[PDB]
Ligand binder design. Structure first.
Ligand SMILES: [Mn+2]
Ligand SMILES: [Mn+2]
Ligand SMILES: [Mn+2]
Ligand SMILES: [Mn+2]
Length: 317
């Protein structure tokens, strides 16, 4: 069957902001380069993958306080203004990108393209929850964030693949457990979960996570190779009988609190209370409110992108 496409919205409209020139502007003079690029990427995906279901996953909280309470450095270098409990912090985002996010969300709502979010959770969690719950169609998670490689799956069916945007959508290929194992040296049988454990130990500078001091990616891969899982590694460190080196024991035991805190920070939630903006995740074949879509697209200077999208949808079986 055709796959369900799960889109990491913010990953994609940040890419379009940096991938489309800012001289692409609305009639009021505001840049719409991210709007155009994001709509164009949806059209490209629709034509390439021919889904019947598609969801744009939102960051209802791009930096959830429950993660920050466990590891205060988490995404701290990306905060423009911290906000008190219950209110998402203000992310450091170019001043001419934030209005384009609002424009994109208005167009998606008027067209009726499903969007999904969960209060207090990241789009990463929405993605992990929807991919974990899927039972009918193969899943393609579309994102430039390597965090989502932890979702890859072969069994139980359906499979989950990450269409990884690190080199842009044109060069993007689908990553599964084999690709993650081959590229990161984690065990194939649990590649996705092992990748999150590897990332935990080695660190994640874009998210402000230091990892375990003195455990780089090569040491983390060999420890997972020998012991199979992070829990087995911790067990090997806690048991003075094991063949774990004394130096590795010292590094791991010195970080027991960080490792416990980081496990829940690094792993995407798989049971977030996701809500849809639409009744189903079915991709509409024409605008739910075509007058409002034409008005918005004219005002936002992306009328031709919307026309190309409706062409792509017209070509679906
Ligand atoms: Mn806050
Ligand atoms: Mn994210
Ligand atoms: Mn991360
Ligand atoms: Mn992330």
């Amino acid at each position: 069957t055709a796959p369900i496409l799960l889109l990491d919205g913010a990953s994609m409209w940040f890419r379009s902001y940096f991938g489309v020139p800012s001289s692409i502007k609305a009639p009021d003079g505001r840049p719409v380069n991210a709007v155009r690029g994001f709509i164009d990427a949806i059209s490209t995906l629709v034509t390439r993958e021919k889904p019947r279901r598609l969801v744009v996953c939102r960051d209802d909280d791009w930096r959830p306080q429950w993660r920050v309470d466990l590891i205060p450095s988490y995404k701290a270098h990306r905060v423009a203004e911290p906000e008190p409990d219950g209110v998402p912090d203000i992310e450091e985002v170019p001043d001419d990108l934030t209005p384009q996010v609002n424009m994109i969300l208005e167009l998606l709502d008027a067209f009726g393209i499903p969007t999904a979010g969960a209060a207090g959770f990241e789009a990463d969690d929405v993605l992990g929850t929807l991919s974990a719950r899927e039972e009918r169609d193969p899943v393609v998670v579309v994102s430039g964030d390597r965090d989502l490689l932890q979702l890859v799956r072969d069994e139980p069916a359906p499979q989950v693949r990450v269409l990884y945007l690190g080199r842009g959508l044109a060069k993007a290929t689908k990553w599964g457990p084999a690709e993650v194992a081959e590229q990161y040296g984690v065990p194939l049988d649990r590649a996705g979960t092992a990748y999150a454990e590897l990332a935990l130990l080695r660190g994640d500078p874009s998210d402000g996570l230091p990892g375990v001091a003195g455990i780089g990616e090569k040491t983390a891969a060999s420890l997972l190779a020998k012991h199979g899982s992070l829990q087995n590694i911790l067990d090997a460190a806690h048991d003075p009988k094991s063949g774990l080196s004394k130096a590795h024991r010292t590094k791991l035991l010195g970080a027991v609190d960080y490792i416990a805190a980081a496990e829940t920070v690094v792993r995407v939630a798989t049971d977030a209370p996701v809500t849809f903006s639409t009744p189903t995740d079915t991709l509409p074949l024409a605008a739910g409110d075509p007058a409002r879509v034409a008005e918005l697209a004219a005002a936002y200077g992306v009328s031709s992108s919307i026309s190309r999208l409706q062409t792509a949808l017209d070509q679906l079986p």
